[PDB]
Ligand binder design. Structure first.
Ligand code: HEM
Length: 291
C-alpha cells in the first residue's frame, strides 16, 4: 500500500494557519465542556486514535485516509466518547470545506497541544480522503488492563521504540478517564488542561493503591484523588521504561522535545511525502499572534 501526500489545491501556510486559528479560537470559546477541562484533551485523543490504527507490515490504517468519518471506525468501542471531538470539528470543516478529513483531525491534535502550552509540533499537509472500504476493522487500538510487555509489543506495530512510547504516554497528564466511555474513572493530576511533565512526577511521587472501580475494573488510585491505568503504572514496573520516566520527571525540556518528535512521527506514519512537497509548517499560537 503506498499513500502519497497531495497538497490541497493551491493552498499554502497562510491557509492552514487560518484553520489552526479557527480551532484555537473555538477551544477558547467552548471552555465549559467536561466540567471546565475544555476540548483540548479529547482532540489530542482523537488525533492519536485516527493514527493508532496503522500497521507497519502492510501500511493499512493511519491518519492518511480520514476513515474515522465512516460508521465502522466511528462506532469502534475503543473510540467511545470521541464523538464529542468530531462534533467540535464539524463546524470548522463546514467553514473550510477544502481541507481533507485526515488533515483536519491531525491538525486538531497539534492545535490543542500548542494552545495548552505544550511544545511546537511541526505538521505537514496532504492527507487524502479514501473510500469506506479502506476503513480499518475494529480491534487495532490498545487495551488498558495489561502490563509492560503488552505495551512494548503493541507499539512495535506502529514502530515506536521504548523512548517514543514513554514520551507519548506523557499525554495522559491531560483530561480524564470517564466511566461510561471506558470503564475507568478519574483524572491523573491537578493540571489536566495544561501540557506539562506532571504524568511522570505523579507516577514517581504519589502513593498508589490498587482498587476496583464501579465498572468492576481495577485501577491505581492515590490519596490526592488521581488515578493511573494498569498500562500507565506499567511504566514504573519495567526497568527500561522506569529510567526514561525518571529522565522526563527531571527534565521538562527533554520531555517536550521528545514528545514533539514522536507525536509528529505518529501523525505521519504510512504517508509518503514527494521531495517537491513543502516543508513542515510550525504554526503560531493565538498568544504569539496577539489574538
Ligand atoms: C497503551 C496506550 C494507551 C491506552 C491503553 C490508553 C487508554 C486510555 C483510556 C482508557 C482513556 C480514557 C477514555 C475515556 O474514558 O474517555 C484514555 C484517555 C486519554 N488518552 Fe490514552 N491510552 C493510551 C495511549 C495514549 C497516547 C499515546 C495518547 C496521546 C498521544 C493518549 C491520549 C489520551 C488523552 C489526551 C486522554 C484523555 C481524553 C479525555 O480527557 O477525554 N493516550 N486513554
Amino acid at each position: 500500500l503506498v499513500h502519497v501526500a497531495s497538497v490541497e489545491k493551491g493552498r499554502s501556510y497562510e491557509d492552514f494557519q487560518k484553520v489552526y486559528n479557527a480551532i484555537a479560537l473555538k477551544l477558547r470559546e467552548d471552555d465549559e465542556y467536561d466540567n471546565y477541562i475544555g476540548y483540548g484533551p479529547v482532540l489530542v485523543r482523537l488525533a492519536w486514535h485516527i493514527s493508532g490504527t496503522w500497521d507497519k507490515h502492510d501500511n493499512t490504517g493511519g491518519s492518511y485516509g480520514g476513515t474515522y468519518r465512516f460508521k465502522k471506525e466511528f462506532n469502534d468501542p475503543s473510540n467511545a466518547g470521541l464523538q464529542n471531538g468530531f462534533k467540535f470539528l464539524e463546524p470548522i470543516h463546514k467553514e473550510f470545506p477544502w481541507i481533507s478529513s485526515g488533515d483536519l483531525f491531525s491538525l486538531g491534535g497539534v492545535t490543542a497541544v500548542q494552545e495548552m502550552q505544550g511544545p511546537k509540533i511541526p505538521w505537514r499537509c496532504g492527507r487524502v480522503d479514501t473510500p469506506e472500504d479502506t476503513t480499518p476493522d475494529n480491534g487495532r487500538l490498545p487495551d488498558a488492563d495489561k502490563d509492560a510487555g503488552y505495551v512494548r509489543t503493541f507499539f512495535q506495530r506502529l514502530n515506536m521504540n521504548d523512548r517514543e512510547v514513554v514520551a507519548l504516554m506523557g499525554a495522559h497528564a491531560l483530561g480524564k478517564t470517564h466511566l461510561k466511555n471506558s470503564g475507568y474513572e478519574g483524572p491523573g493530576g491537578a493540571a489536566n488542561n495544561v501540557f506539562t511533565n506532571e504524568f511522570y512526577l505523579n507516577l514517581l511521587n504519589e502513593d498508589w493503591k490498587l482498587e476496583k472501580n464501579d465498572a468492576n475494573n481495577e485501577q491505581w488510585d492515590s490519596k490526592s484523588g488521581y488515578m493511573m491505568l494498569p498500562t500507565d503504572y506499567s511504566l514504573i514496573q519495567d526497568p527500561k521504561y522506569l529510567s526514561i520516566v525518571k529522565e522526563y520527571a527531571n527534565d521538562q525540556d527533554k520531555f517536550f522535545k521528545d514528545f514533539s518528535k514522536a507525536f509528529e512521527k505518529l501523525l505521519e506514519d504510512g504517508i509518503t511525502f514527494p521531495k517537491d512537497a513543502p516543508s513542515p509548517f510550525i504554526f503560531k499560537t493565538l498568544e504569539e499572534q496577539g489574538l
